Amino acid sequence: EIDPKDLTFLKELGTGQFGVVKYGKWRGQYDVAIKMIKEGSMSEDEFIEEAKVMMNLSHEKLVQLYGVCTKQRPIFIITEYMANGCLLNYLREARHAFQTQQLLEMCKDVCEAMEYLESKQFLHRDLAARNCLVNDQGVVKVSDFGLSRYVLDDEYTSSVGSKFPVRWSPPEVLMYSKFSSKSDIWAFGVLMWEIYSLGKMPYERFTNSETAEHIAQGLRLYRPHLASAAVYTIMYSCWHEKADERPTFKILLSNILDVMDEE
Numbered sequence: 001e002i003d004p005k006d007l008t009f010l011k012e013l014g015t016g017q018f019g020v021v022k023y024g025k026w027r028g029q030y031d032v033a034i035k036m037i038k039e040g041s042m043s044e045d046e047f048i049e050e051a052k053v054m055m056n057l058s059h060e061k062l063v064q065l066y067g068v069c070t071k072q073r074p075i076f077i078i079t080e081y082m083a084n085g086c087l088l089n090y091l092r093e094a095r096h097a098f099q100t101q102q103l104l105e106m107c108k109d110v111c112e113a114m115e116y117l118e119s120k121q122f123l124h125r126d127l128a129a130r131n132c133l134v135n136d137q138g139v140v141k142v143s144d145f146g147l148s149r150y151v152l153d154d155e156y157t158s159s160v161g162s163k164f165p166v167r168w169s170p171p172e173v174l175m176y177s178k179f180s181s182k183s184d185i186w187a188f189g190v191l192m193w194e195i196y197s198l199g200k201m202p203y204e205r206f207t208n209s210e211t212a213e214h215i216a217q218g219l220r221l222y223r224p225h226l227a228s229a230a231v232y233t234i235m236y237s238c239w240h241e242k243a244d245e246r247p248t249f250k251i252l253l254s255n256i257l258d259v260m261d262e263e
């Protein structure tokens with residue numbers, strides 16, 4: 001529990017599923033981001049109970065939760081501040097002129113975070129470049145893990161809703177609501193595709209509805225130009241039609257390290 005007397009509100013950082021997020025300082029010293037949870041957007045009591053478990057998730061590649069303000073409304077969520085914002089927009093800025101080793105290191109950052117979540121049996125459920133952030137050193141960290149469970153908007157939570165992450169979801173989620181570790185694995189493969197494509201929309205010439213068909217029929221994202229055969233094999237291995245034949249994040253991490261050594 002953070003005391004809101006110890007916060008300031010300095011600049012807007014944009015809006016997400018729960019409303020506005022601000023940059024400010026905590027204790028007059030520490031940079032933070034502050035989610036101000038919009039009324040009606042969150043299952044607040046459930047989140048408050050889960051925040052207790054989320055306070056114990058800590059890894060260098062996970063955005064760090066500093067605390068919450070829950071003796072008031074709106075509730076606030078206080079985290080690590082990530083100076084370069086979301087990965088998706090960062091990827092899309094041509095000035096960065098990334099080398100492919102830098103792209104692979106972004107995949108590795110995310111894979112490390114995801115291996116830690118997997119070790120805790122904790123699903124993200126919306127892993128995608130829009131839900132990763134980049135700090136002032138260029139390190140990518142996974143954000144907003146587990147928070148999909150508290151979203152009240154049916155357009156997000158329904159698998160045929162307009163906001164559901166269709167292009168990041170495996171067939172068994174879209175058809176049956178079968179969420180598992182292996183559904184985050186599928187999304188991670190799509191995220192590597194986003195990274196190697198410099199932030200293109202997956203299935204860029206298809207709708208959500210056409211994507212769900214394409215993939216249920218066995219077809220897959222093409223190799224981005226910047227991806228070697230070895231990198232494409234890694235992302236592609238995340239998309240096996242049999243969930244149980246997809247790798248774990250531990251295996252992915254070893255594969256990524258091997259390719260880094262090879263390249």
Ligand SMILES: Cn1nc(-c2cccc(-n3ncc4cc(C(C)(C)C)cc(F)c4c3=O)c2CO)cc(Nc2ccc(C(=O)N3CCOCC3)cn2)c1=O
Nearest residue numbers: 013014015016017021033081082083084085126144147148
């Ligand atoms: C910690 N933090 N947070 C956000 C932030 C802000 C708005 C929304 C969200 N967001 N994103 C996804 C999401 C998903 C869900 C589910 C439930 C759908 C998964 C639930 C949610 F609450 C959310 C959610 O709030 C976040 C990330 O949390 C943004 C941060 N930093 C910056 C820094 C710079 C700039 C910028 O302006 N620039 C200018 C151009 O150069 C680059 C930098 C912008 N932001 C930050 O440090």
